[PDB]
Structure formats: structure tokens, C-alpha cells
Design a binder for these strands. Structure first.
Ligand SMILES: [Mg+2]
Ligand SMILES: [Mg+2]
Ligand SMILES: [Mg+2]
Ligand SMILES: [Mg+2]
Ligand SMILES: [Mg+2]
Ligand SMILES: [Mg+2]
Ligand SMILES: [Mg+2]
Ligand SMILES: [Mg+2]
Ligand SMILES: [Mg+2]
Ligand SMILES: [Mg+2]
Length: 182
RNA sequence: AGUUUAACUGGGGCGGUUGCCUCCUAAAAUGUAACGGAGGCGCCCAAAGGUUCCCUCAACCUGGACGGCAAUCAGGUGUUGA
């Protein structure tokens, strides 16, 4: 009875546009976004685990889902890290949660991006993938700026079903992220 | 005053060893020496035990920023090279 505007968009207009613009043999060659990944590894828990709790608090308030933290999958003396210390916080999505969060992000954080300049095609990998790292956490609405103690990191990435980068870029710009003009 | 004050030893003495475990020497059953070649043990564990269940890496291209050659990542060749 309730469902996200991007879900509808995908069903009716994005799918039709991509089909027309690439002449797929079948309807569903249309790649579809698979997983929005939201993790973080500070690397500072090796000296103090207090900041990890705050980062997870930010992740929970941003998502409402309870992020996990992983240990030192290997151990490195140079990084002063031993296996078993928690360094990486994760929080994942799927489906309606994926696209509600994506709509909120596109509507709020992107126009809210200080000195926003658009994102380039070239950080793809040719297989329809898209991932990079957030300047600052404070960009988000539900988070409180008066309570942020130290500027820490967040990431909410997107992925595709695209076989190559061509379809990935086509559908992604159809969704309408701010690609550069070069 | 009665006694003790090791053996191995390529002469003795000084060095080193003295039991146990792994490999090679070992001639494709076992076994098989040398002061031959090389390494460890005199523990750890209420779970690192039992069982049931889930699942499997690392190699890999990219980076909304720190964050770098490497921190967490997901897309999608991935057969122990972890
Ligand atoms: Mg894809
Ligand atoms: Mg006598
Ligand atoms: Mg003798
Ligand atoms: Mg002699
Ligand atoms: Mg001698
Ligand atoms: Mg034999
Ligand atoms: Mg003999
Ligand atoms: Mg020894
Ligand atoms: Mg058990
Ligand atoms: Mg992935």
C-alpha cells in the first residue's frame, strides 16, 4: 500500500528509457541496484575504543539499523594493529530501505554538499560499480551538529547489476546523480 | 678419620652432549650409526572439549576524505597461492 518513489520510477520510466536507449533483446537485461554499503573503519580503536561507539551511534541514528564492527582481519605491526581489535563498523541496507535511504541522501546531502562539484564517470571500474568516501558526517539532517564531538567518517555506497560500465553510467545518470561535464 | 669427585670422547683434558619430538642421511615394508646435516619439547586449554547448525578464503580493479602501496567495504574472474 506504501512503496518508494524510486521503486516506481524504476518500474515505469527508468526501465523503459534504458530499454529504448540500448535495445535490449529481453526486458530484464536492465541492471538493477543490488546493495548500498555503509561501513567505516577509523583505525583509532587500536588506542581507544570510545570513538567507535560514537561512530556507531551516528550510523544507528542515520539508519536506525545496528552497525557491526570487525576485528583486525590480519595483524600489522607497522599499523600497530593485532588481529581481534575492532576497527571496521558496518551497516547495510536492502530493498525499500535501500531506496528510502537513497532518496533521502539525494534530496538532502547532495544539495547540502559544501562546494559540491559533481561526481565523475571515471571512478567506475568498467563493470558497473560506484564507491568513494564521505568528506564529513555532519552533512546529514537527522544527525545533530551540536552533539558531534570529533568529525569522523561515514560511507553509504551504491552498486549495480550492470555487466559493464556503460549501462551502469546510463542508469545511474538516469537516476540523476551529478556527473561532471567533460 | 672413612670416603666421593660420571660416561660419551677419532689419545686424554678443555669445549659440547646425555631424555623426548620433526625431517634428511635411510638404498620406494620396518628398522638402521656417527662429535653428520637442520629445527623444537619439559606446555596451553573450562574451553582452543562434545555435539548441532550456518557459512567459507586469500589474489582481485575502484575509490563520496581524511584514508596513504596496505584500515571496511561492495559489485563480480576467485579453487588454498591465505
Ligand atoms: Mg551490476
Ligand atoms: Mg673402606
Ligand atoms: Mg673416557
Ligand atoms: Mg681419534
Ligand atoms: Mg683432548
Ligand atoms: Mg622406510
Ligand atoms: Mg648399531
Ligand atoms: Mg633447543
Ligand atoms: Mg564447543
Ligand atoms: Mg562486493
Amino acid at each position: 500500500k506504501a512503496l518508494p518513489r524510486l521503486k516506481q520510477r524504476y518500474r515505469e520510466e527508468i526501465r523503459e528509457a534504458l530499454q529504448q536507449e540500448f535495445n535490449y533483446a529481453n526486458v530484464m537485461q536492465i541492471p538493477g541496484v543490488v546493495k548500498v554499503v555503509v561501513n567505516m573503519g577509523v583505525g583509532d580503536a587500536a588506542r581507544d575504543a570510545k570513538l567507535i561507539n560514537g561512530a556507531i551511534n551516528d550510523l544507528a541514528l542515520i539508519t536506525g539499523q545496528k552497525p557491526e564492527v570487525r576485528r583486525a582481519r590480519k595483524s600489522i605491526a607497522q599499523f600497530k594493529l593485532r588481529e581481534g581489535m575492532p576497527i571496521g563498523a558496518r551497516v547495510t541496507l536492502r530493498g525499500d530501505r535501500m531506496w528510502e535511504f537513497l532518496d533521502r541522501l539525494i534530496s538532502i546531502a547532495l544539495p547540502r554538499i559544501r562546494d559540491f562539484r559533481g561526481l565523475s564517470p571515471k571512478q567506475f571500474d568498467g563493470t558497473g560499480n560506484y564507491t568513494f568516501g564521505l568528506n564529513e558526517q555532519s552533512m546529514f539532517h537527522e544527525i545533530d551538529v551540536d552533539s558531534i564531538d570529533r568529525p569522523r567518517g561515514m560511507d553509504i555506497t551504491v552498486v549495480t547489476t550492470a555487466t559493464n560500465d556503460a549501462e551502469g553510467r546510463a542508469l545511474l545518470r538516469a537516476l540523476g546523480f551529478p556527473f561532471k561535464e567533460n
